[PDB]
Amino acid sequence: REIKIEGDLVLGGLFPINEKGTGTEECGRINEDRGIQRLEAMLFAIDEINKDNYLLPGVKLGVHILDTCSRDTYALEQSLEFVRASLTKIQENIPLLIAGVIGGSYSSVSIQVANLLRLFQIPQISYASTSAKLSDKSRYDYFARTVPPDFYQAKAMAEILRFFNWTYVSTVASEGDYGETGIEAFEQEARLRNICIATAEKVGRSNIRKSYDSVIRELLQKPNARVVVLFMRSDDSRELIAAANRVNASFTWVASDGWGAQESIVKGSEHVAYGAITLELASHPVRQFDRYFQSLNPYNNHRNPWFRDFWEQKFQCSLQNKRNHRQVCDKHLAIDSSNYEQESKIMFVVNAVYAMAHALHKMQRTLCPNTTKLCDAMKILDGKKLYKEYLLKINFTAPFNPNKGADSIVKFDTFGDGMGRYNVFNLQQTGGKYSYLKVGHWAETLSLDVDSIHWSRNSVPTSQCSDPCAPNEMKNMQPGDVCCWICIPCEPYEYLVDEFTCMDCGPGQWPTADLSGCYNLPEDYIKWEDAWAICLGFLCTCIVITVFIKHNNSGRELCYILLFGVSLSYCMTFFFIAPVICALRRLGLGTSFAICYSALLTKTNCISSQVFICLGLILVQIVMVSVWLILETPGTRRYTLPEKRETVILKCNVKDSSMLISLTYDVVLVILCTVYAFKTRKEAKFIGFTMYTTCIIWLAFLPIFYVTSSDYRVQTTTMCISVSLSGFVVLGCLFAPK
Amino acid sequence: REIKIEGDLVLGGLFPINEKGTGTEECGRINEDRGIQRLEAMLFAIDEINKDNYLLPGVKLGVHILDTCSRDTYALEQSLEFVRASLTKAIQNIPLLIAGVIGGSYSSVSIQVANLLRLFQIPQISYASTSAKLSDKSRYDYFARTVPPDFYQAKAMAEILRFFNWTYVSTVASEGDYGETGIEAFEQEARLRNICIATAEKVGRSNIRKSYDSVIRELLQKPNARVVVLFMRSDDSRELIAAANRVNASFTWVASDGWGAQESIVKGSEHVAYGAITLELASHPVRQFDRYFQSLNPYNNHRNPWFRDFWEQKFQCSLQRNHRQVCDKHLAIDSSNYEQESKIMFVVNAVYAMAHALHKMQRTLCPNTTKLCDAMKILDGKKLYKEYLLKINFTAPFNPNKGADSIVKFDTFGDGMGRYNVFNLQQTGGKYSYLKVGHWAETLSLDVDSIHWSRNSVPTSQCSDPCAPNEMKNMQDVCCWICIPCEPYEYLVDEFTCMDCGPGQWPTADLSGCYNLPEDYIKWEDAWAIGPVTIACLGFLCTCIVITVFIKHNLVKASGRELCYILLFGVSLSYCMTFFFIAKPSPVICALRRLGLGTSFAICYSALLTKTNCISSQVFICLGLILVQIVMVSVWLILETPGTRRYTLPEKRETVILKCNVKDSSMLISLTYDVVLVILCTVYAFKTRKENFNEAKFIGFTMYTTCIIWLAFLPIFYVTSSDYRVQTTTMCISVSLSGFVVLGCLFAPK
């Protein structure tokens, strides 16, 4: 049983013609869609190839097509005939020269012959072999395929979820190579798309609580996970939907080719699956093949040995009257549009034959140009050269495809795989009827029709257990699932350092809404703290008042001392209010010594005519020495005022000892003057009134302490001190007017 | 050509009989050691097997032995004859039924036939293939070997370095499967033994300056890595030593099976490679094989087709061609012209291993039957390989030391046991020769005392020295640390990272050194040396003055309305105040005592002010106590806010920190005393303006200078010095100032 027809080159064909019909236990069954249909597709291509005038003109291509019986072990023994021929060793059935093998539908079959043909360097193009193992070129060195591997569906399904802002996916793989290997790619693909997996459920051919269990393992755990990424086989997908039907589940299944566009998956229980998004392989039916295939007739098809057996099984009749098994075939029986439907993967079978033909055609030009036939160099073929140099780099457009200006580009990648073109289907309800409808293609980039896709909720569903969080809600704690954390509003006035964790450098004053704000305390001014105390200015008013008093003003001794004190008192308010300028408080303390010195001079007069000048210098010297002692080591700078997370102000020196130190010098002078005023009853006693006002000012000096604690409020003491200075000066001038 | 003899179940064999002889382009010669010798071993074993009675008695083993010609591609088409046995598809040499194949030789050959025979489920035992790739049971399922893979050498060599504490090593591999696939295993093995590679050369070319610079790379990069782990091929190992000889370097090479006991590697330039350590597979020569092989005769060995070709090539004659000689009849193989091949033990073991599995299967699948029953008419490779062949445990045949580690068994991957022989190049007087100094079966066992080294001493190859006593500041030279001393008396958490908390404070090197209170501020009169004498002198002066007032009264002097007693009482109280605070400085209340001392000094000054306010005695006495209360009220108010405490005395260095008091509080206390001193200063001016009173005026004027001097001394007293030298001196200065005030007060009473 073999289609061995002669030719300059001969191609090997491996098709599952018998659905374990030669297995001797599942015997008596041949495959129609995956068998003769795909087989005759290759023969159809070969007829076109050898009659084509632009692909191998002088080279007539024969075939050596064998049956794999859908069993890897049977294929291995069969495929040896491709090897037995291309080696160095009455006799009949002279061996051929298999240039390449176009065969292997079931990946288990296509793997066990990939191992064999690799050793003897025979290229192999395999339609319909989408297993991801075959992409491992370390083992299957000489394997190419016109169909994409099954892990490209993982990429497309991941892109579909990522497109719709979807996360928290629950995946339900299936036992076997298909479900398990495919979901590994999807699990890997979800990470790179920042898609997190709620549940990693798995199913098997059990038909037990497992199916009902798997349904609730997603309804119960994370009901926020509304999208379910199926990667199950065909029969498994139906039985899971049956399980979901009984419990009346409501999900938006994002399924793989195993579900596909088959209506038999949802035959019954459609509302539970309504809104699902399933993928299917992209394939444009070959128009010419139907004309060729429908014209087949056992009375004109003698190349195919299985065709006579196919005719019997197709129509359940007998070509010979000796059987009469329920019917005898008749001459008007034929293949027509009603009893036939083109297989989904006929496009890939034709491409596989053409890809081999194109590679052989190109190698015919390079190896020996200007040679219509095949040269003696062509008489020996090398697998490594034919595979990597030409076959693994061909770029011809697909034949028999009406839409040439489309994705009809036949080309193998660096792994010999397909290009990965899919059709994003979507189960839809028209109101009383359910039917699939293509809603998007996936060549390399997804392209959907969002406004024509029915969902299960009649609105675009979202699978979220945590909404995204912003510069508001900066932190991120993860109580349950790794992906949907709970964001926490960061302690106010903070520092972002990470999305997960967020600390606080400057929780008191002036950060940014980003990773920048940390104690960003711009300095204030001389009167910056009392910007809006409510009390602006008023320092020049004391100078104006002092100027008016000076304008109003025998007893030249009082004028000499009183005039200096009035001027110094006014300057204290300006220096105190408006780092170097922070030392003006020393002058104000020295000014009070002038009043004390005058009181001491007045006390001496009441109790050395030339000693008055020396006495003033002696008193002035002490004030200067004290200022130099303190202003020398400390001072000349300003100290900040960082409160308990209130704000940051770069004020003057926070050392209150300078005020206390200054008051000490005045206190001694004031204390001495008060003692003299006690005996000043013999105008007399006017100093006592001025001396008494100093005691109140001394008490007012105490309010400065514990008064500067209020920012911009302690400055009233400086204004009060200036006011106190005016009162003492007013007492001296008040007596004179009377 | 093949030895296709019949049998109940027949084995297959692949041997490199022809050194690419069929590939006449490469070399037409045939292998003798790896070829006929190994082949005849298989035939010798089969003759032994079928003549036994406790291993396949009724099952006569046959052979179908083919020549792999030492090329894998030629082996594949040859091995197909084994494959065609199990195919269900007018004359016909009918095929046999190959239970298993005993062959593979070169790993490249064995890999290709492993792929082919894996598909058709035929077990394969390789007597010589040792590539690490064949241990991957995912690709070569039905493959077993009686020799260990090549990565066990990497495991064995790494254990030699670990045993000898060598940690910083350089490696020099070759190009190809042997050099690469092994050295990567060694590099992985180095991690588990905490070993890092100084430099990893990959000199694999035939002969270029790559080896010359490779020796330089050994010299330049890490000269402190004296031992170098070679994993490179036999011919390459020869030229590397020659390169090392030219530069006249000196290392202690740790080689592999590539450079084993082959003296041809060091033929010439023995001294440069002297002291090396070389591994080599452990194989015991088969005594019975020598009698069989030497007794072979081209007139007796008609089974072997290549024997006539072997006879001609071995003896360089011809049996009939005009060769250099006609093959004489009395030529025979003897000990002079024959040395048993190293791997003959494994060839016999491989045949016996397959025969043992088939016998054990016969005892199970066909019990109570001396022949093979109907079940064995068809054999299943999967069951035979996975159950019987992969779990055999028979002791090696023809082994002299029975019961030793010479037991044939396959591990989970169908590999050999892994026995090696650690050799060492010796200096035997004036001659260099190899000698076994160890054996790595599965744990290293070395004759560590009888091994000669290049430097005549057990060498060490390290780029770092152990900095255990000090220098817990290792810098990671890569993988070897650079130890830096930790700063004097600083904290530590890890020898790798000294985190430098408190340098100069805590004197413990055991992961400490930061602030831990290493000093005490207590100083009993400067250790009773300086300043302590002044404390006792204060009491002596008071006793004389106290008695003097009573003696003068018993009044003889001016009555003064008891003013002298009030002034004397204040003077005594002030003098005792300074001594009391110093005597108890550890207590927290000592700071309060120092603060109260200033009030006593003001009290003595206050008494002078009351005395100065003489020009109403009862009113003056009451007024005097008012000043003390005013000073006491200020002290209580200011002291109440800080309360009782004893702050520390942190220092820039030396770790001199004493919890005595607050320096700022002392300055505040000193400033607080200034307020009382200010009143005393004001009193001095009043007294100056104003017989018996003349003496008081001089004392009051003198007291003013002492107060001014004391205040000036205090600001620079103990402020710029530590509590043991300057602060203690300042404390003594304060004590001296308090005593000096008593002297001024004493002068006034006189």
Ligand SMILES: N[C@](CC1c2ccccc2Oc2ccccc21)(C(=O)O)[C@H]1C[C@@H]1C(=O)O
């Ligand atoms: N292309 C298939 C894919 C096949 C498959 C397709 C859909 C669902 C389940 C499923 O089972 C597996 C498991 C592992 C690898 C491949 C598959 C191939 O055999 O490679 C096969 C349909 C092609 C055909 O036989 O016509």
Ligand SMILES: N[C@](CC1c2ccccc2Oc2ccccc21)(C(=O)O)[C@H]1C[C@@H]1C(=O)O
């Ligand atoms: N067993 C060997 C080992 C061989 C080898 C041995 C020593 C040095 C280099 C080297 O090159 C490689 C590289 C990869 C794998 C195996 C080897 C085989 O060829 O398999 C071959 C000696 C055995 C024989 O045929 O006598």
